[PDB]
């Protein structure tokens, strides 16, 4: 079920435009400190560091705020929305601008900006400015890194037996179930000094957890070896958390976790314990079960795209989707996928908008076999 498509245009966000003022990322923070950052309202999105955000700006005061941010530290703060409305926020992330284009178009200003997350934080207070853009008191959250669990109890003499030869070949049977067995046998050999077996220590190994997650991802859809998957557990965990089909509360729980190992364990538990989905306002459907969650993009099954009216929707690309009805013609105006034509998909029961049917425009592609859902109404069970 493979189609000759270049999985770089959905990430490139070519639907907005091409003549974009490319900006290089050179922002950071002093780690675990108090800061003040302006917040752009009217955004309902839990954002993870490394996740791409496409934004459309309409109100003049928001345009002024983003322009001042550009002539400043070009980082705003995406707030974390819980179930309770009215800015019931306790966490958030900092988004960095790398993508600025104004274009007053019909004489407005419509700043089109694309940003990604860089750091996490917690809001201490939400100060409201009379201008219309609230600047909140921000405490930057450090990202903890932990050493190997065998470093403390390791035997000094058998430390030379700790550099294993590089992994043999790739994606080959018995090149993993034996190499990893030997790796566990030789790495956590000092577990005999403690009260816990080797497999328990491998349950907390950063490398082993990433290997398990990679196996599960390949079970979902074929990933091209090291298909842009970072070797660092930090970025790997962040990417996995970004691509998982989970609701807002699960995303904020993954965001508050401060250690990569705990994040990887939580993600592996989530995708080994959640199989059935549903849509809000029904709580009665199971459209698009896990075993068919494809990924027709570099970033993964889930990504962020924006309509021509500022509204941002995160979509889930799946192979098949039943229990749906169609309204409207297969338009090709502002489809986020250049080689596809979009159609409005309505829920067959609650008639609350979930999904978009897609059709064919070319030859070497999948004709009318495509679906992109939304997190507007999508929860796991």
């Amino acid at each position: 079920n493979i189609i000759n498509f270049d999985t770089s245009l959905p990430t490139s966000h070519t639907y907005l435009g091409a003549d974009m003022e490319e900006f290089h990322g050179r922002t950071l923070h002093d780690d675990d400190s108090c800061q003040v950052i302006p917040v752009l309202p009217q955004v309902m999105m839990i954002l993870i560091p490394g996740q791409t955000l496409p934004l459309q700006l309409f109100h003049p005061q928001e345009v002024s705020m983003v322009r001042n941010l550009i002539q400043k530290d070009r980082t705003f703060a995406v707030l974390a929305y819980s179930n309770v409305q009215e800015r019931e926020a306790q966490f958030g992330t900092t988004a960095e601008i790398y993508a600025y284009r104004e274009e007053q178009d019909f004489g407005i200003e419509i700043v089109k900006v694309k940003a990604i997350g860089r750091q996490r934080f917690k809001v201490l207070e939400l100060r409201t400015q009379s201008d219309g853009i609230q600047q909140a008191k921000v405490q930057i959250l450090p990202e903890c890194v932990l050493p190997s669990t065998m470093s403390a109890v390791q035997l000094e003499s058998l430390n030379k037996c700790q550099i294993f030869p590089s992994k043999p070949v790739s994606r080959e049977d018995q090149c993993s179930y034996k190499w990893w067995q030997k790796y566990q046998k030789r790495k956590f050999h000092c577990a005999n000094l403690t009260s816990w077996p080797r497999w328990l220590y491998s349950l907390y190994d950063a490398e082993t957890l990433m290997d398990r997650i990679k196996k599960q991802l390949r079970e979902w859809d074929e990933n091209l070896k090291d298909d842009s998957l970072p070797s660092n557990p930090i970025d790997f965990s962040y990417r996995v958390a970004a691509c998982l089909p989970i609701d807002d509360v699960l995303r904020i729980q993954l965001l508050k976790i401060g250690s990569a190992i705990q994040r990887l364990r939580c993600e592996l538990d989530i995708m080994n314990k959640c199989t059935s989905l549903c849509c809000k306002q029904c709580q009665e459907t199971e459209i698009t079960t896990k075993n068919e969650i494809f990924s027709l993009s570099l970033c993964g099954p889930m990504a962020a795209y924006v309509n021509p009216h500022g509204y941002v929707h995160e979509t889930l690309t799946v192979y098949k989707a039943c229990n749906l009805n169609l309204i409207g013609r297969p338009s090709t105006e502002h489809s986020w996928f250049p080689g596809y034509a979009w159609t409005v998909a309505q829920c067959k029961i609650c008639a609350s908008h979930i999904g978009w049917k897609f059709t064919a425009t070319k030859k070497d592609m999948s004709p009318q076999k495509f679906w992109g859902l939304t997190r507007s109404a999508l929860l796991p069970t």
């Binding site: 009216h309 409207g328 338009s331 409005v344 309505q346 609350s352």
Partner: peptide
């Protein structure tokens, strides 16, 4: 020009567009 914004649904009249808008509401 009758077209929804929360969704993207397109219409040739206004009654169904308003029905869609109020269905989005709530």
């Amino acid at each position: 020009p009758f077209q929804c914004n929360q969704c993207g649904a397109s219409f040739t009249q206004k009654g169904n567009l308003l029905r869609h808008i109020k269905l989005h509401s709530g």
